[PDB]
Every structure is written in structure tokens, then in C-alpha cells.
Amino acid sequence: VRFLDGHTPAYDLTYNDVFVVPGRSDVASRFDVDLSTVDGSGTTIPVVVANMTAVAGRRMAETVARRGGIVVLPQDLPITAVSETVDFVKSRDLVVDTPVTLSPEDSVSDANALLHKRAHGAAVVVFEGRPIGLVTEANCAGVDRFARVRDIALSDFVTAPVGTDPREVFDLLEHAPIDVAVMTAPDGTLAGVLTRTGAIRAGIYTPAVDAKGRLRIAAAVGINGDVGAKAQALAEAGADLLVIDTAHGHQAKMLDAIKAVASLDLGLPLVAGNVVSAEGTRDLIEAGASIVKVGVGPGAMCTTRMMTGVGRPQFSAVVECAAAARQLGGHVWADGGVRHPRDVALALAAGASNVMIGSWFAGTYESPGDLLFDRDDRPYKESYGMASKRAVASSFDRARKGLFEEGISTSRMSLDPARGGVEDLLDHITSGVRSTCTYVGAANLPELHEKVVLGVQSAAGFAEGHPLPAGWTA
Amino acid sequence: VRFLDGHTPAYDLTYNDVFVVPGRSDVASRFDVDLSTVDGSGTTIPVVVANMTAVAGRRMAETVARRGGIVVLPQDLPITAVSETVDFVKSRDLVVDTPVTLSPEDSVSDANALLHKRAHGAAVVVFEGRPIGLVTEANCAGVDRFARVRDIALSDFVTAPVGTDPREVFDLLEHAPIDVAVMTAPDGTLAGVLTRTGAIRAGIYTPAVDAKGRLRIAAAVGINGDVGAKAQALAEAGADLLVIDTAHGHQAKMLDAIKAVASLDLGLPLVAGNVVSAEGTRDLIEAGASIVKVGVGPGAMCTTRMMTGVGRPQFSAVVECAAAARQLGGHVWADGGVRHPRDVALALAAGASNVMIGSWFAGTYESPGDLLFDRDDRPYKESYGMASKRAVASSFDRARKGLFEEGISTSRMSLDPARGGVEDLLDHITSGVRSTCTYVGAANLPELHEKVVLGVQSAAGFAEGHPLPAGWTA
Amino acid sequence: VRFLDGHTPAYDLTYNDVFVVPGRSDVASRFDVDLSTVDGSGTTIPVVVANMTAVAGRRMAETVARRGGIVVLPQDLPITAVSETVDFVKSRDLVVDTPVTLSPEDSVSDANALLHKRAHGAAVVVFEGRPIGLVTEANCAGVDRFARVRDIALSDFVTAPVGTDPREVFDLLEHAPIDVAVMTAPDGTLAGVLTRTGAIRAGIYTPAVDAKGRLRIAAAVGINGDVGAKAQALAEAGADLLVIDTAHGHQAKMLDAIKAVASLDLGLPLVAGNVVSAEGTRDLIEAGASIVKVGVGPGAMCTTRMMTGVGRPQFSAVVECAAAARQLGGHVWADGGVRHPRDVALALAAGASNVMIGSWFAGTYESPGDLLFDRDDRPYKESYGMASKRAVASSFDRARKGLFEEGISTSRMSLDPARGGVEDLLDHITSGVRSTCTYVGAANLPELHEKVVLGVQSAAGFAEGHPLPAGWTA
Amino acid sequence: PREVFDLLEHAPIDVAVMTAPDGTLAGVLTRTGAIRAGIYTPAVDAKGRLRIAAAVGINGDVGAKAQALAEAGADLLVIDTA
């Protein structure tokens, strides 16, 4: 990392304190930039979804994996649920998305409540596996909310065989009143749905797949209990990457867990965290970890700074740990504190190979939480922290241990009133990163790290320019 | 105190300007940390209650002393009141708490007004020294407010002999409709009450006791008048520690008072303040003081900064005075400016041996003030400063001196709507300090001071993370 | 009652629907009007305080009785409390008022909380029965709230022997900084206090006294249980008038209770209610009642109209019952619905001999409730209904009976920010009644009833003129 | 119900789980539920089962719909229109 001449502050820096200076560039178009990562995770975009119960669902897993990202399943998830989620994710199609399925005997209220599980805007009515109609938000309005969806479903919709080129589907949907194309299997059953923006993204994004050509997925494990057995079970379940997560990664228990997991020779990339120092990164890498997760404090659901005073600004910790890992040949992930695409761009320019996003993705349709409405009826969801699931651990002892346990924080994440979907957030993030690469003059992320020039700004410098629209920021 | 490389600001630092960097740790559990102090005060927790008339009552004294802290009685308190308070505090039980006692002829309104003097949630009806029923807030609702409590008291409650193991009381209260166990003396009179959380805290906390096994208590004295006689009277009254308090401790009058008190050889630890410089600390220690109180300006009720410009940020003053006192073999207390547990953690990491908390504890049930309700009916109390009681001092001369006297400031401290009690604040503070010790890797406070690494952050760094719930901050 | 020509509405009328037409008058001054009643109650003003626990205290009893009114003690009050209240009321002085007494060891907060029990604005510090100083609201401001009142009491105050002519006390207080004159007994003990307005009222108002020259007081009894024994006990306790009160007075149980009470020949006036019909009034009078209480529904704490639909506008019920009672030689009291002095004036013009006022007097200093402050810090108190105490009546049967029992309503009554006292409300009411008498041309209440001419107005008619200041209306 | 009320008098949760003789779940009863069972009388048919009514419009074949509703077990028929 190269800083401007004389920019040597006497304090640690956050994302708001730094800026990127443009350089001489030959990359003109954003599409000339390669966003693939080199840390062995297999993602084609630098976006990773945090192992939080409020974001890491199966719908989010499928949606993020199709666009090139990866989702880490939260720790302490039962192995049966892990197996079911992995099977569902790996049974999905690489291009066609899974729609919301409704029965003709469902009520209008149930249809309107299930319509918001995806970002397609419409659901397919299925009778014996075959599509027979579409249900939209407009059709549910102005009717009895306990009427059957059979009386409101429209029987005319665009249909194409599965495997059709996305441009043909786009041309077919160019003149359709509903921007949903129902793709069917050769026998006639429902294969899925494809929208116009879905076709555009299928032409823009590359899915993150394994050796067998199926969508990738990761799983997280804690350091309590028998870490080796849990890691072996998760590897057998089909996880493509293992994360050993704890609040304070620089301790003997985490080193023992890393050694125990590495001694099994599972053949999967190993991620450990979290540390904010170079010594902790070196210890984690020497223990056997391939990737080090960096960040203690900047989590949006984290109250460690206010309760203990322990923490560190994320930018300085990321640059230090990235320098240490590069000196040891490892890689670092930047976890926590991401609100804008500029945060992802600065984390990538700081030397990180991947950025992990948590509560920001909670305000989407694909997140497992329930959709709620505030005073102004603006859509929002609720994000909450993992709390004691990230900590080291009769009814008397349970109460005694819980008296000092970290509480579960809670925040409201507003959905974008115009888009709402997580793929739009991915579009914003990737557009910002590509524009950063074009401004710096880099064709890929390593060149972005090697060519970037950074400077320090005051509080008045951060207020320059125009803010982002609502829903584009956490 | 060790700072990060290059973190040498050109200004003095407050608690908001600094953070603690995690290090390699072997302490995994919070309960493995020893929070006892080494300054000779006798406290098992680093919390000290300020000598303010708005906080330092007898209920607060008992409650804090039972949990390992100590309360300093405010100066200029009449010696008879001092003796009564000391006798009441030293006559209390080490495990069982003192309940609110009601007569069966009392009105419902009086019972509902007395219910908020403790944090038990219920009061005991006493007839000739024997408990006959319990009164709760639910029973007082929906009835005539001038009806007798005999008509609303419930006659069925859990009863156990005094001296019973707290776990047995917890098991008995596991299935009780009211979480209050009435502990009685062998003859049958009322010994006190014990709750489930009370048993948990009795199993977690260690009472601060003297050589005779009775709860400790301290007293404060000013530098006006005959300081020696007042100190001797306070020592004879039963005070376990003496505090010589004034607004400007670095002056000749304070040195004379310290010498006069030390010449009596009372055998008690001597605390003097306040100073914010190393030279003042050295002068106070050489004068005869064993502990030096540090802080001029950060008091929540103090208007010195706005009236005179005299003051100093608390963190830098604390580190400097702690270094000076350690170089002279003394100890320092950090007085004023504490709003969050992180403030206590940073004060302990700065080199202080004890933290004195004032207005924050005013927003509790145990404080001597009256409970009030704001617009939203949220509970709160009123905190105010000592004013001329901390300063050096016919109707014409009284008015002449009072024309320039410092006024009494006033603020509203909101109670935690879910807890309200001071023991919950103590739980939060101790949990934060233990988590800080685990993050640093220290088994006790001296190791916390010796192993801590600190860094400087900007205003954007302090905004990282999630804020604390309501009532957890001053 | 004579109405204007053609004013024969097809509905029942409230106080807001009627107005008084002025006639030829010879009474010019308000002081020429005689406000004494002729119903045998003994009141020199037509104001009676309702038998409600929120208004009928001993302070209110003394204050109202001194000015010519009477207070009815609430039913179900224990006989010991009745005896104590009667003794306190009958031990008072006819001119000098009872002050708030403070000990020199009391705190400033206790003094400031006790200052609002009376309307004098100051309290007397008493040491061994002798006054030694005065404490006012101004002295309590700007000092430590836990300081003793000895340090704030002023030792210079106007003192006069008891029995002094009120005009001399007024002349002495003409030049006093504090408008409180401490009247002392010949031995030197505290006899009481007298203000300037107190002397004016002693020169204007005539106390309501019994045959022995002591302040009068009444008591109320329900129709449940042994009514005869309770009435005998209340008569022996010293009550000057008995009220048999129930929600529905026109029923067999009330008639039986009236007969049982009348068979004892106690020699006291008997009041029964409530009825809103002429037949009920005739039945109550024939049963043995001398005075009939009229009103079912208009009570400010009464929810009968909204729960059952049972009720009647108060003006029509009062005129009908007054006509019936006059035809039988009895008298009627108008109970409930009084918010303005015009309501009292119209009730007296409607034929009633006394007006019973409830919740309106709850917003005074003398009421037994505690003084509270709203958002704007405006003083107010809480009024509530008697509920089941006005109705006919194991833990299973108690719950079964309480499931259908009437709940306790609650309202906020704002105090007059400039006066606050109940004597000011009495002044407003008496001034309004005297002005009504002067407008009609009557020298007394019977002439007011015989000479009054009434008319009916629409909703627009009631909106004419200027509203009353804050605190002058319920 | 009075026995259930006495049992729930000292329970931390005011819900009594009533079970069938075999041990399966029959239902729940609260204190206020027992009070109401002692106060209110259930509306039952000739067989001692809870009553229920049904409504029918005036469009279509009203007779057939009414006959079907009567066969379904409705205890009272409502012919409703604006």
C-alpha cells in the first residue's frame, strides 16, 4: 500500500478516513475488469456473505452462489439441516432461478405473504408439477384476502424450454406484460423462471461452481466441543470451504482447533478469525489456516467497543494483516463494517482478497427474516447478532453463565423501495469495484492492490459529493 | 502504558479517543479473571461510589458493599448520621438483602411509593416482626389507592431459614410465581429476602468486608475547619477509609490538611484529590496521602471547563498521575467522566487501581433520590453536584460570599426500563472489565495494566459497532 | 320552573342546553344575597363535597366546613378512621387554619413535598410546640435537597395572639414580605396560621357549625350488610348527617335500608339516592328519607351511560325530582356533572337545595391525592370513581363476582396554576351564584327558584361569550 | 372447573393442560376459562354439540344451496342481501 507524500497520521484509519487517488489508466470499460479472487475460495466476485442466522439462508445461498459469491452457513446448525441446505443449493440450475410456488387452493393473503420471498415479482401456480398461471401483487389487490388464488391467477404467460439462450428469453419478454418467463422441463414440469434482468445478469456474472459444476457453499464451525469431528461432518456433508469463527481468534483454544482441523487433511480451504494484528495473523497462518478473517469491533451488531473498549479501525487492521499474510503467502478476508460499495473497494485496495458482508444483506427479499413495514409503510427487515455463538463456552449454572453472556443486538435494515433484491446490491457493489479498478488502471484485483495510491482526508473531505440513494447503503 | 507505533498525537486524549488492541490470550472464561484491587481499599471490584449526596445513601452503601464495592459518604454529613449509617451498614447480612417493610395498616399508594426503594419487585408485610404476606406492583393496580395493603397482600410465598445455601433457594424459587424468597431468623422474625438473581450474584460476587467480617464503608472530609478532629471523629465512627476531597487538590491548604490527618496515625488508607498533574500527585503523596484521586473537569455535574477553561482530558491525566504514583509506590483513583463500561476498562488499563462513579448510579432504585416519570412515563431520577461542598471557604457576608459561589447543576438520569437496579449496572461493568481482561490476556488488573496495548482513533473510529441498550449508559 | 313561551323541546335538557333570562331586580350588590340552605343540612353555601375517596379527606373536610360547606365521608370507611376524622374536624378553629408543621431535622425535599398539602404557600417549623421559623418554596430552591430545613428557615415572621380581629391581622400583613401570620396560643404554642385572603374569607364566609359550635361533617353508608348498625355507629361517632348512597336508589333494598335507618330515630337528616324520576323520589321520601340525591349517569367518573345506556340529562331529572319533593315537602340534592359555576347556578334555579361536587375538587391542594406534573410541568391530580362501593353485593367466588364488576375509571384534573386551592373554587362558585341571584332579582335561594325564568338554546348559543380561565372548570 | 382453578391458583403459568385418559392432549383451561364455564352456558344442538349457522345469497339456485347447507349440519340458515 502506497500513501501520499506526508500522509502519516498519528491514529488508525477507518473507511471514512481514506480515499483513492486516480492514476494513469488504459482500462476504459468496466467490463474489461476481472473480479475473480485468488484466495482459493472459488468466488468470481469478492463478495462473501457472513455466517449469520439473519442472512445465511438457503434462498440467499442459491442467489449469491449463482452470481459468483458464496454464503457461509452459520455455526451450530444441525448436520441434518446442513445436509438439506447443501443438497438444495447443489440441485439448483446455473442460469434459471427458483420461483415461488403456489397451490391453486391457497388464499390471496398467503400468496401475498409468499410473494416477497424472491425478487421476481410474481409466483407460479403449480398443479401436479405443471405451471398453470402467474400471481402478481396487482392481482391480489382489490379482492377478498381469503379468496383462492385460482380466481385471480392469469393463464397467459411467456414459456420457453429450459436451456434456451438468455438472449432469446430477453427478446420474448421484450413485449410481455409480465417480465417473467416460465422455463419448463422437456416433460412439461416447472424448471424455473427467468426475467430480463436475470438474463442480463446471466450474461454478466459467472456462477461459482465446484469441480462437478454445482453451486458452491461454505459452512462455519465454532471452537467449542470437538472441532475436528464437526469439521469432518461438515466436509462429508458437501461443504466447499470451512470457517473457524470466534470473537477473539488470537488465543490458544483457536490455535488448538486449527491444528485439530488441519490434522485431518480434509482438502478444503480453511478460514480462521478474527484477529486485527500482524502477530495474530502470523500465529493463525502458522497453526494451519490458509485464510485469516480480520475484524474485531466494526460489526454492525457488535457491542464490544462500547462494553470493553477493545477494537481497532478496520482499514488499518486490514492493511496490517494483509501485509503479514502476503509476507507469509496467505490471504485475508475483511469482516464487518461494510455499508457502502466504497467500503468494499477500499478493503480490496487495502490488500484483502475477499469482503464479508453481514447486516447489509439482511435488508433483502432473499434473507430468511420476515418482511415488515414501518410508519411510512417502507419495507424493512430486522438484523441481529450471533452473540454467544461467537464466544468460548443444572439451571443454576445456566443462569450463572448467562448473566454475563453477550446480549443479542437488533437493528432495522431498510429495503430499497425500488428494487429490494440482493442482486441489485451485488450490481451496485460490483459496479463500484469495477469503476474503482478503471480509475486506478487495474485489470484485476491483484493489480488493484499493487497500483493503488491512497490518501488521508478529514471529516470535511468525507462530506464532498452527493450521497447515495435510499437502499444503496446499510 | 504502551501505544501503537506512530500513535503520538499532539493533544490530550479522552476515553472516546483511545482503543485497546487484542493480544495473545490464555484466559478463555470471564470467571477466571480476578478483579480484586491492590490499593488497600479492600474492594473486590474496581467500582467506587462517589461521595455525592445524590448517590451515597445507606441503601446504596449496603448494596454496593455486598457486591464487593465501597461507598464514600459525602462530606459535611453530621457525625450522628455518619454513626447511624455505619451501624446500619455493618449490621447487614453478607448474603441476604434488606427488604422493603410494610405495615398492614398502610395505604396502597404508600406501598406503591415504597416499592421502588429496592430492586426486589416486592415488599414484605410485617406484623410484630413476622412476615405475613408479599405486596407487588400487580396487586396495587386496579384497586383503590387508599385501601389498606391488608386487602391486597398475598399470604402464600416461599420461605426458607436464614443461612440456607443459595442454590437451594434458587431451586425453591425455580417454580415460584413470585421470584422472592423470604428468609427468616430461627425464632421466626424477618431476616430478609433473596431472589434468584440475588443467589446468582452471591455465587458470583465476593463481599467487601473488614477484619471483623462486616461490610466496609468510607467517609469523606473537606479541608475547611479542623480537618484533624473531623477525621478522628470519622475514624472513631467506624469508617474504613478516609477521603480528603476538594476541587483543587494542588494547593497549600490541601497539603496542610493531609499532614494534619497523617500526623494522627489513624491507621486507615488516606485518599486525597483532585489533581491532574504528575507534580501534584507527587506533592500529595509526599504530604502523606496513600491514594491520589485524579480528575478536574470531566465530572458530569461539573461546570469548571465552561466557566474557567481549567481542566484536562481524563485519560491523559490518569496515565500521567498513575505513572507518577507508581514511581512513588502510590495508587490513583480515576474520578469523573464515566458513562460506559469501556470507560472503566480504559481507566483500569490506564494504570488506575479504582474508578469512582457518580451521576451514573443516580439513575437507580437504590439512590436516595425520588423516582420520577417523564413525558413517556419512562422512569428517571435527578443528579446534582456538590458545588460549594467541594470548595475552599452576618447576612451581608453570607450573601457576598454566595454571589460568587458555584451553582448546583442538575441533570436527568434515566433508569433502565427493564432492570432499574444498580446491581445490573455492576453486572454490566464487571462483565465488560472481564471481557477486556480476556481480550488482553490478563488474569488480573495488574497484568491488565502491564500487558495492555493502546491505540488512537479519530471520530469516525468511535462510531464503529452497535450502541448499548437504553439504561446501560449514563 | 317557568320557561319562555314556546320553549317546549321534544328531548331532555342538560346544563349546556338552558339559560337564565334576566328580570327586574332590586338586589344590586352580590353581598346582599343570602346563600344559606333550608334543607336541614346546616350549610351556609349550597356546595357539598361528594363521598368519594379522592376528594373527601380531613383537610378538605376542615377547609370546606370552615367556609360554610360540608364534606360527606366515603362509605366503608372504618369506624376508627371515622372517629379520628370527626375528632380532628371538630377540634379545629372557626377562623384560624391548620398549617403544615415541619421539624428542624426534616430534609428540604420532604418540606417541599409537604408544602403542597395546603394553600398557604409556607410551612411552620415547630420545636416543642413553638413556632421558630417559616419555610417557603423560594427558600427550598437553589439548595441541596437533602439539607435540613433548619438551614433554610427564616426566623422573622408576623405573629399575633389567637382571637385577634381579622382586620388587625390584615393590617399587620399589609407590609409583610411573607403573607402568612402565625397565630399562637396564650401559653406560646402554635394555634395556626392566617393569611390576608384568609381574613377576607373569614369576613365574607360563615362557618357551618353544629349546636355545640363545632364544624359539621357528614358520613355515607351503603345498603349492603347491616345498615342499621352502621348508621348507629356513624351517628355515635359524631356525624351530623347520614347519606345512604347506591348506584340505583329506586329498588327494594334501598327502601328496606331507609326504613331500617329511620326506625332507629337517630335524629339526623337522612339523604338517599340516587334517582332520576319523580316516582323514585316519592318512594324514597315515603320510605323515610328527608333529602333525595338525584343523578344517574352524569358523574365524571361514571361509565353507566356507555356500558348500559341507562341515564338521564341532569337538568330535567333535577327539575322533575325537585317538583316531586316539593309536592311532598322534601328536598333534593343535585349530584354529578358539575364543571362550571353556571352548572351550580342552574341546579339551584332548577329547584335543588344543594349541589354535590366530586371530581372538580380533586384538582386542589386539599384533596388527599398526590400532586403530579404533566409534560408542560402543569400541576394536576388524579380523580377516580368509587365503582363497586356504590353497587349491591373462596377465591373462586371472588373472581366470579369481580369478572362482571365495574372498573375504576381515572381522569386527570388540572390545578389552577395561579391559585390551586379549593377556597378559590369556592369563591368562583359563590360569586357566580350571587351574580345569578342579582341578575334574577332574588335575595335568597328560595326566591331564586321562585322568580327564575329559563330558556332553551341550541349548540351555537352555548358557544357565545368568552370561556373561563384555566383551572376554573373541571 | 373449580378444582382446576384451585390448582392454577399457585401456578407460575395460568394454563392447565387437560389430557385424555390415554394421555393425549385434550385441551387447555385457564382460570378465567373456568370462571366463564361457571358463568356462561354453551349453545348446543339436540345432540349436545356446539351450534353453527350458515349464510346463503339469493343468486343461483338458492334451494339447492340451502339443502346442501342443511345436509352439512348447519343449525340455522340466513338468506342475506343488501
Ligand SMILES: Nc1ncnc2c1ncn2[C@@H]1O[C@H](COP(=O)(O)OP(=O)(O)OP(=O)(O)O)[C@@H](O)[C@H]1O
Ligand atoms: N434445525 C435448525 N436449527 C436451527 N436453526 C435452523 C435450523 N434450520 C434452519 N435454521 C436457520 O433458520 C434460518 C432459515 O433458513 P432456511 O431459509 O433454510 O429455512 P426455511 O424456513 O426452510 O427456508 P424458506 O425461507 O425458503 O422457507 C437460517 O438462519 C438457518 O440457519
Ligand SMILES: Nc1ncnc2c1ncn2[C@@H]1O[C@H](COP(=O)(O)OP(=O)(O)OP(=O)(O)O)[C@@H](O)[C@H]1O
Ligand atoms: N443529618 C443529615 N444532614 C444532611 N444530609 C443528610 C443527613 N442525613 C442524611 N443526609 C443525606 O440524605 C441522603 C439520604 O440518606 P439516607 O438514605 O441515609 O436517608 P434516609 O431517608 O434515612 O434513607 P431511606 O432512603 O432508606 O429512607 C444522603 O445523601 C445523606 O447524605
Ligand SMILES: Nc1ncnc2c1ncn2[C@@H]1O[C@H](COP(=O)(O)OP(=O)(O)OP(=O)(O)O)[C@@H](O)[C@H]1O
Ligand atoms: N383506615 C382506612 N381505610 C380506608 N381508607 C382510609 C382509611 N383511612 C383513611 N382512608 C382514606 O384515605 C384518604 C385520605 O384520608 P386522610 O384522613 O389521610 O386525608 P388527608 O386530608 O389527605 O390527610 P393527611 O393529612 O393524613 O394527608 C381518604 O379518602 C380516606 O377516606
Ligand SMILES: Nc1nc2c(ncn2[C@@H]2O[C@H](COP(=O)(O)O)[C@@H](O)[C@H]2O)c(=O)[nH]1
Ligand atoms: N461481537 C460480535 N460480532 C458479531 C455479532 N454478529 C455478527 N458479528 C460479526 O460482524 C460481522 C458482520 O458485520 P456487518 O456486515 O454486520 O457489519 C460478522 O461476520 C461477525 O464477524 C455479534 O453478536 N457480536
Ligand SMILES: Nc1nc2c(ncn2[C@@H]2O[C@H](COP(=O)(O)O)[C@@H](O)[C@H]2O)c(=O)[nH]1
Ligand atoms: N467541580 C465539581 N465537581 C463535582 C461536583 N459534583 C461532583 N463532582 C465531581 O465529579 C465526580 C463524579 O463524576 P461523575 O461520575 O458524576 O461524572 C465526583 O466524584 C466529584 O469529583 C460539583 O458540583 N462540582
Ligand SMILES: Nc1nc2c(ncn2[C@@H]2O[C@H](COP(=O)(O)O)[C@@H](O)[C@H]2O)c(=O)[nH]1
Ligand atoms: N356509577 C358511578 N358513579 C360514580 C362513581 N364515582 C362517583 N360517582 C358519582 O358521581 C358523583 C360525582 O360527580 P362528578 O362531580 O365527579 O361529576 C358522585 O357523588 C357519585 O354520585 C363511580 O365509580 N361510578
